[PDB]
Amino acid sequence: MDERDALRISREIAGEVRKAIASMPLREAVKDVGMGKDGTPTKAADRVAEDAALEILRKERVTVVTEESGVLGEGDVFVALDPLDGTFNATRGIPVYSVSLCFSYSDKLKDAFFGYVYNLATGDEYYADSSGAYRNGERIEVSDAEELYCNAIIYYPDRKFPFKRMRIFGSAATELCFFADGSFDCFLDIRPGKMLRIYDAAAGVFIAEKAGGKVTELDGESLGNKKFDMQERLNIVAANEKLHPKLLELIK
Amino acid sequence: MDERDALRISREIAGEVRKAIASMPLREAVKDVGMGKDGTPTKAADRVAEDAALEILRKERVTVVTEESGVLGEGDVFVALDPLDGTFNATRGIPVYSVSLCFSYSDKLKDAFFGYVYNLATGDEYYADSSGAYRNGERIEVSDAEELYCNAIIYYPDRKFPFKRMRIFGSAATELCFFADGSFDCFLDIRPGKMLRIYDAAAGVFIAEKAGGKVTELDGESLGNKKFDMQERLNIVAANEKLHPKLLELIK
């Protein structure tokens, strides 16, 4: 499987997940239907989305690490799948949620070859491959902002900060892309619990890097050894290479 | 002018604002075109929205307090107009922004008779009159949550807090409605600078009250005396009666 196969497969998945979600009424979608393998409830919305995605992915030689159903399959290509990221938004009719896919040539993030985030509410398509990062077919890149007085997405502000603005939308996959295209100057999940799972962030990180962003853990260590398994957890500091170290110092 | 007149006029305005905005490309929309009478730049998108709204409002015996153009007209009915609230979002293709209108029989919020917020990106319609609060025709009401461990919209988190989730979408008009319909358990703008302007909050406050929410200033004081002028500024604590005082204690 190569980066063109991946785009083809992801698009097909985005299409089916969109169909499934849309043909579900809010009152039915918000319902708890079971316990995710991740340890959090699976909403009906999560279930229908994962089903449509898994239906397509089983026809491939891959191992899938997906939020509601855990690890599936045997292949050597590894796929981190968030079938529905921003489920809380989705169930409230709030239009920020996406299906997220990252593909890797091993169970570690450093071997990622394709990242893909499709906003299921707006239809915006983000992906990145060896050629670069795209929003709706157009090349994107991170902003040139050098100042801490900038536009930040941050989980969670636990003190007074210097940012121009702070936002929290409730979907890291999509929010990493907001950073990837330059809409926001930086992205930060600095929650002490390390809440981010591999499928939440893998795609977005990959896209943001292709878009020129520097993306690390809290101390600035590489994300390269982050594993595609249910146990993996992440803190993230993303910014252009000039803003990035200023952020590291700010949270020290 | 009564509460049915206001509904008719607000809907007409929403339709025209959506038309005006949608007919503009992001690259043209995002441009600074002037200085608002509020003291912040007016984007192209802000200007075209305001123009559409003012064409319809100039034909009524009203005084309009609007963000980009300031105070206008001489009528005894006062209208707080945010022609585009969430402009930052709108210019970035982020689908959380609205046009906001509160109508009052005096220049003080205590005499408000109609509240209206129309999401320009999703078409959701929120309003409230003497009969209650509506989302897209359907009656709404705030959540019953009693615990601080709840779903919060808060500007801005500046210390560790007890909430289940924190969200910041960048449009208080819409976010006040998210609270009004129970999607979030509370809404807080506690910024030291007291940043909210009358047209940012008036409608949303009105709708949220009709929905059962208790909505006050920082110290629990009434909002009734808040004036429909450019000088007015607000901090907000909104919740159901049970949750509200717990929040007041939390932020002391």
Ligand SMILES: N[C@@H](CC(=O)O)C(=O)O
């Ligand atoms: N983004 C796809 C459509 C989809 O994935 O739904 C395309 O451009 O064809």
Ligand SMILES: N[C@@H](CC(=O)O)C(=O)O
């Ligand atoms: N991840 C939760 C929110 C949170 O706990 O940050 C959600 O479903 O949105």
Ligand SMILES: N[C@@H](CC(=O)O)C(=O)O
């Ligand atoms: N998924 C959320 C929904 C809610 O808070 O009402 C939870 O139960 O934590």
Ligand SMILES: N[C@@H](CC(=O)O)C(=O)O
């Ligand atoms: N990463 C989790 C937590 C959050 O964003 O609140 C999610 O995307 O929902």
Ligand SMILES: N[C@@H](CC(=O)O)C(=O)O
């Ligand atoms: N919400 C209006 C339509 C609009 O204002 O655009 C209606 O119910 O017809």
Ligand SMILES: N[C@@H](CC(=O)O)C(=O)O
């Ligand atoms: N009102 C600003 C955001 C903020 O200062 O919170 C904007 O949306 O442009």
Ligand SMILES: N[C@@H](CC(=O)O)C(=O)O
């Ligand atoms: N309206 C914002 C836009 C931005 O921050 O890029 C500003 O005041 O500059």
Ligand SMILES: N[C@@H](CC(=O)O)C(=O)O
């Ligand atoms: N633009 C956002 C935030 C702010 O301006 O304070 C609002 O007014 O709702």
Ligand SMILES: [Mg+2]
């Ligand atoms: Mg789950």
Ligand SMILES: [Mg+2]
């Ligand atoms: Mg998910």
Ligand SMILES: [Mg+2]
């Ligand atoms: Mg997730």
Ligand SMILES: [Mg+2]
């Ligand atoms: Mg302005």
Ligand SMILES: [Mg+2]
């Ligand atoms: Mg505005």
Ligand SMILES: [Mg+2]
């Ligand atoms: Mg506003």
